[PDB]
Design a protein around this ligand. Structure first.
Ligand code: NAG
Ligand code: NAG
Ligand code: NAG
Ligand code: NAG
Ligand code: NAG
Ligand code: NAG
Ligand code: NAG
Ligand code: NAG
Ligand code: NAG
Lengths: 494, 48, 49, 97
């Protein structure tokens, strides 16, 4: 069984006093006129999903509903919030309770507290570990269903339980119907009266007149046409395209090399025509540092490059800080310079247990220049020297210019769907639109096309060299044609 | 005059305004939120 | 980019109908249609005024 | 630390002072500061509400943390000041509005 939520399930969203104002708010409310599941207690206490949050309501004549259970398994295997109201004493506990196969009341704990004719409404939500309880009790004269009307709920309790709640169950007193409605992130307009009591409400996503009340900040709408929204078509599925290459990039040949070059004569290895899995380098605990100046290290798996170069050499530990864009010093200026617009990551680890002996084979002296009483000096690295120990540093320089990408990370491609609105990813380039066949003659060296706004106009599919046009999915202003609200609540939409 | 005003407005989308890229998706696909937000604020200020 | 153009309320055809009405009025009734009713007048007499 | 404007349970080491009504004062309520005249009010705060706010998001009223009564906050009198003067080639006497 299901019923109509109507206008029930709005609560005072904050401890801020307001009056005579049409204030607007976004919080997890019950959506207006949505369905709520209707349960019965005659001649029904199942476990329900909690989802993003719950409105709960019940109707009483004899105080049958006395409690709630919240958790994931509700079987003593996890912590579960228990609320019970027996006679005049409200009891709250969050123990790893052993609940019955079918919990009811007859007629490692982290918290404990002890204190139809009646409608008792509640709101439960679980935000960053905080279980927030709002409620309202009101007299009623109705047995069949939830009464229609409006009256908002105050917040009463906020329990810092830190419990992951996915399911909940109620507790009945056996010798009282109840409703369960899912909260959603719907913006509201709320009529605070002179006393500051919310006396009316308008759900924004209910219907086009309600959008118009949300747009004008008014419960009354004048005769006219109002631009409430922009209609935009949504995509269906994502499309991921990368060259179908299975070769793996030789990072091991750079990072696990028998010998590193000196900084005065640093090596520059080209990485191309391969799959670059950067999760290995990032997750590895062997590195003393992994600092990215270009892109974030976790994005490297999706993103891909025209080329990647690995600059490999040995420096003294205290000089690691100098290998960065914007830095100056005797190393940054004299022997190894990066562009100040450098894109990439600097990875380094000590070699105190490998290169140190003393080891005098390491000598030091524009961006990416190799400069092959003298300017030439060297180090004697010994195992007994931290800031004076040798470090192996590899600088990964990434070229992200829009051109055919030779280095693309470990991500599987999908099939391509034409003439449908889709979320696409071509060699790390993303966007949303309709991919169609085209007559745009890209030259063999061209990979991407562009519009006046510098947005992508067309792309060359990286697996099959054909050109696809990108046209954003149909969109436009909505407008609501409405007579006076007094004349009618009926509306028409452009 | 109106055509020129609109063409100018559209061309401004190609400007970086101090950001690493004029393309919003390229910022988002490359930077984590704590850094992406800075680059985006630069574009928002310029475009607004 | 979000840049659109709205149509005018009065289409070119409707404007043409208005200029036609104003012109027909001017020719067959002089200025009387401006003040009140369109009062027919021989064009040559209208010019005399 | 949760600094959301709500009743404070943990307050920093600092002695309170007496409260003076109907006079321009520099106030501090649970760490919330500003300048204004504190007066008696008829604003019925609900038991869970600690602060009230205006359209500008400025504080409209507060609940006194020691005695649970509501005080309205009216910013201290202010206004533009204009000087009415004949040109200085006639007189250096002025009137002030
Ligand atoms: C022009 C018009 O229809 N005005 C009516 C007014 O007479 C009526 O008292 C009010 C009810 O709230 O609704 C509006
Ligand atoms: C609510 O349930 C009825 C069936 O009783 C169904 O026809 C209606 O579409 C449902 N509405 C929503 C919003 O789920
Ligand atoms: C309510 O339950 C508690 C146990 O959680 C029990 O100690 C108490 O006696 C019960 N009821 C009353 C009215 O005290
Ligand atoms: C309490 O938690 C600990 C984990 O720190 C666990 O080992 C122990 O078994 C739990 N106690 C019970 C009664 O399950
Ligand atoms: C506010 O409360 C008073 C009772 O104190 C009541 O008479 C009035 O109708 C209520 N509504 C207003 C004025 O907001
Ligand atoms: C270097 O060798 C270690 C094994 O000792 C391995 O775990 C690591 O992934 C290798 N590094 C690279 C870049 O392949
Ligand atoms: C993609 O796979 C096809 C075989 O189905 C092959 O002919 C084509 O060359 C591959 N594309 C790339 C860029 O490697
Ligand atoms: C402040 O002190 C009074 C006694 O003068 C006491 O009754 C009141 O409860 C105290 N307020 C708080 C918030 O503790
Ligand atoms: C203004 O004052 C000057 C003296 O500095 C005098 O020469 C001049 O005539 C005066 N003009 C008027 C209009 O009073």
């Amino acid at each position: 069984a299901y019923t109509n939520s109507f206008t029930r399930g709005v609560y005072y969203p904050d401890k801020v006093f307001r009056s005579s104002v049409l204030h607007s708010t976004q919080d997890l409310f019950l959506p207006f006129f949505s369905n709520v599941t209707w349960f019965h207690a005659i001649h029904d206490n199942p476990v329900l999903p909690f989802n993003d949050g719950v409105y709960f309501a019940s109707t009483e004549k004899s105080n049958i509903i006395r409690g709630w259970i919240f958790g994931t398994t509700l079987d003593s295997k996890t912590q579960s919030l228990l609320i019970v109201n027996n006679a005049t004493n409200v009891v709250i506990k969050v123990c790893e309770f052993q609940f019955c196969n079918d919990p009811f009341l007859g007629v490692n704990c982290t918290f404990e507290y002890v204190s139809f004719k009646n409608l008792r409404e509640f709101v439960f939500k679980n935000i960053d570990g905080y279980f927030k309880i709002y409620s309202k009790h009101t007299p009623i004269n109705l047995v069949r269903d939830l009464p229609q009307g409006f009256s908002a709920l105050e917040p009463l309790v906020d329990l810092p339980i830190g419990i992951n709640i996915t399911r909940f169950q109620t507790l009945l007193a056996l010798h009282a119907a109840y409703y369960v409605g899912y909260l959603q992130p719907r913006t509201f307009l709320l009529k605070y009266n002179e006393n500051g009591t919310i006396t009316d409400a308008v759900d924004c996503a209910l219907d086009p007149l309600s959008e118009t009340k949300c747009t004008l900040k008014s419960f009354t709408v004048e005769k006219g046409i109002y631009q409430t929204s922009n209609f935009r078509v949504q995509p269906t599925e994502s499309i991921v395209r990368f060259p179908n290459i299975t070769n793996l990039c030789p990072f091991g040949e750079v990072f696990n090399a028998t010998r590193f070059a000196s900084v005065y004569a640093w090596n520059r290895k080209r990485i191309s025509n391969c799959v670059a899995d950067y999760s290995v380098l990032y997750n590895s605990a062997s590195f003393s540092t992994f600092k990215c100046y270009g892109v974030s290290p976790t994005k490297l798996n999706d993103l891909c490059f025209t080329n990647v170069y690995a600059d490999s050499f040995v420096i003294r530990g205290d000089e690691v800080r100098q290998i960065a864009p914007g830095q100056t010093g005797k190393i940054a200026d004299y022997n190894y310079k990066l562009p100040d617009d450098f894109t990439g990551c600097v990875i380094a680890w000590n070699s105190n247990n490998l290169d140190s002996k003393g080891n005098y084979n390491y000598l030091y002296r524009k961006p990416f220049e190799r400069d092959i009483y003298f300017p030439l000096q060297s180090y004697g690295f010994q195992p007994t020297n931290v800031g004076y120990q040798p470090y192996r540093v590899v600088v990964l320089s990434f070229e992200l210019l829009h051109a055919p990408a030779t280095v693309c990370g470990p991500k599987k491609s999908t099939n391509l769907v034409k003439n449908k609105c889709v979320n696409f990813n071509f060699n790390g380039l993303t966007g949303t639109g309709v991919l169609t066949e085209s007559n745009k003659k890209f030259l063999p060296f061209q990979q991407f096309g562009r519009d006046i706004a510098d947005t992508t106009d067309a792309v060359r599919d990286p697996q099959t060299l054909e050109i696809l046009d990108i046209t954003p999915c149909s969109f436009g202003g909505v407008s609501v044609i409405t007579p006076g609200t007094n004349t009618s609540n009926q509306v028409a939409v452009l | 005059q109106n055509a020129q005003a609109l063409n100018t407005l559209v061309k401004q989308l190609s400007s970086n305004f101090g950001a690493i890229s004029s393309v919003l998706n390229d910022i988002l696909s490359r930077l984590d939120p704590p850094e992406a937000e800075v680059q985006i604020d630069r574009l928002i200020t310029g475009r607004l | 980019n979000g840049l659109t153009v709205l149509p005018p309320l009065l289409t070119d055809e409707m404007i043409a109908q208005y200029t036609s009405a104003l012109l027909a009025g001017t020719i067959t009734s002089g200025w009387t249609f401006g003040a009140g009713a369109a009062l027919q007048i021989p064009f040559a007499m209208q010019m005399a005024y």
